[PDB]
Symmetry: C3
Subunit: 262 residues, 3 copies
């Protein structure tokens, strides 16, 4: 049902069964499918396509020529009723594409809250984007990619299938990520390699001097020590019991399947 306080442009096509929340705005020439839920205050500017089994939260801004909930590009997909979930206060810019999941990959593509997805950013099937992320122009995620909280993907940058981009990571523009990126690190190149800790990002996000130092020491254990990952994991765990920010590393290691960028 469409809430009485929602605006739906006469030219927009909202198919019966769609749920449109209070004070939502559906602009000219938009198409909204029957299995779509659009939250309170969310705006679809114009020329937006939203379909599939897709739930969109509150106060989102979705710009013209964006395609949300669409059939994914995985040749394995066969039309199964898979899902998209999008949180609150996201800015989803022109030509952004966010595709539905696959049964094989868990059935769900997820995007959190307060994200900025710039022009022609691509979120493929079965991706999980967290909160407060930035995907710059043409930033492209292949299937099953995780982008953790506060992570930034630079312009023209592509991420290989199944890769994890750790929390607070900054991936430089014009890059190609082929393996997993630990939280807090700077990555650049093709293939992308690590370039230290995202110190400036952490400073701006309120991380203490002590926390940043501990994170830098954890980085040094991984990349400078010359030891194997299995050797340094318990050392990182010991460090984490004093500095809880370091726990991001161990949580990341348990999820990592592609190996680390080096």
């Amino acid at each position: 049902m469409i809430d009485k306080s929602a605006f739906v442009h006469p030219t927009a096509i909202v198919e019966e069964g769609a749920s449109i929340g209070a004070n939502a705005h559906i602009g000219p020439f938009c198409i909204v499918g029957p299995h779509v839920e659009i939250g309170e205050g969310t705006v679809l500017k114009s020329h937006v396509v939203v379909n599939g089994h897709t739930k969109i939260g509150r106060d989102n801004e979705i710009y013209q020529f964006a395609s949300i909930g669409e059939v994914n590009q995985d040749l394995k997909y066969a039309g199964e009723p898979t899902r998209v979930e999008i949180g609150d206060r996201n800015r989803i810019r022109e030509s952004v594409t966010i595709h539905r999941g696959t049964v094989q990959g868990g059935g769900l593509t997820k995007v959190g809250s307060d994200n900025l997805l710039m022009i022609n950013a691509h979120i493929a099937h079965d991706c999980t984007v967290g909160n407060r992320c930035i995907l710059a122009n043409n930033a492209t995620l292949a299937g099953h990619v995780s982008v953790d909280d506060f992570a930034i993907i630079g312009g023209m940058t592509a991420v290989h299938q199944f890769c994890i981009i750790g929390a607070h990571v900054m991936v430089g523009g014009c890059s190609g990520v082929a393996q997993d990126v630990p939280p807090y690190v700077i990555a650049q190149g093709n293939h992308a390699t690590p370039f230290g800790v995202n110190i400036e990002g952490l400073k701006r996000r309120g991380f203490s001097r002590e926390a940043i130092t501990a994170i830098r020491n954890a980085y040094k254990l991984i990349y400078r020590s010359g030891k194997t990952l299995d050797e340094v994991k318990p050392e990182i765990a010991e460090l984490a019991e004093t500095y809880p920010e370091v726990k991001a590393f161990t949580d990341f290691f348990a999820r990592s399947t592609r190996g680390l960028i080096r």
Copy 2:
């Protein structure tokens, strides 16, 4: 004429003279020009622009914000009635652009059948795309480019004007192809360089153990022997009279004008 069994959305604009086949679907806000032919069962999802002298075959799926048959980007083009041909069962994704040819370049842009053209793939004037190809997100072909059967162009990858991408080639993502790529080879980098035979692709497509070995030996003649191309061409021709799959090389050599990637 529009076939009686074709669906044309009330909001779609199909100009008089356009030919729409049986059980075709023209979605909301589509524009179809007077010199366009759309084949049986072909679907234009929504917000699709098809114009120029353009023939589209059967069972195609063309997604929103795609531009098919449009004026090309060659500054030499002056509005001449050039052409686009598109075959059957293609999946042409959001924002894909396929441009009409130029008189100078032969007057025709051609795409075969069973191709997957991912988001924002670009097929410039006078290009020839074969059958069963994959162009990943943002894959960009300059004018007069050939992409032969089964070839794959990775995400964010650009191909220089007049280049040929051989049959069964896999070009890696984030690459820049400046010269001709022989059939069956893996290419990566900027500028792109060869990295052996696409063994896995050939295995999946039913190539025999003997054929793959012969193809590998042909690759070795080209790249490992240290001999000139003119020296190894007759040797490849001799090999081809036992293994007919090797004939792909000699057929490719006759078309090649840019020299080989090395």
Copy 3:
């Protein structure tokens, strides 16, 4: 007001207050905001969004799915009535985005005349594009970028914020420009480095043999001499009093803030 000789498609939405010039063409499903001015003979093909405080000149061709005058992607922007200016005889292709300025960056995004902006070219907030430029497919300018007269940005190429691309420059495809590019030079790579003078471009644009030689000598002072920029600036100024084309260098130096690509 809409001029009596202008065409506005019944499906187009031109908001009251918009100024549409003589013999302009507003195609199907276009949206034109109340603070937009569209000049004599300008064509919006179809599915074009033009909003904000935006002035567009004469004889422009703006293609489907383009977004002109839109809210920029700078997180600092807060909805202030900033501006876009676009000159005459530009060809603005499918999915091109040109964003309004920011108060912080001067309030204006400017594009001159006779430019070709290819598919999905991006002109960010506070950019200044001159005359006769070419931005190829997916060419991406970050905020506050200057692209001077006749400059060419290759396909898949990104330019870092605040950078200046000098007059008559050719930036190769698949590149990443991180610093300022002097006029007349060829740039390629990631990060982009200089590769001599754009001799062919200058020849075609009517530059004399003497002028090109002088420009080459200025290039050699900057890059071959081994001297500092401060040492060679007065030498370039001396050369410029015989060959006025060399004055482009000194004018560029005064604007440069990022340092030179080397």
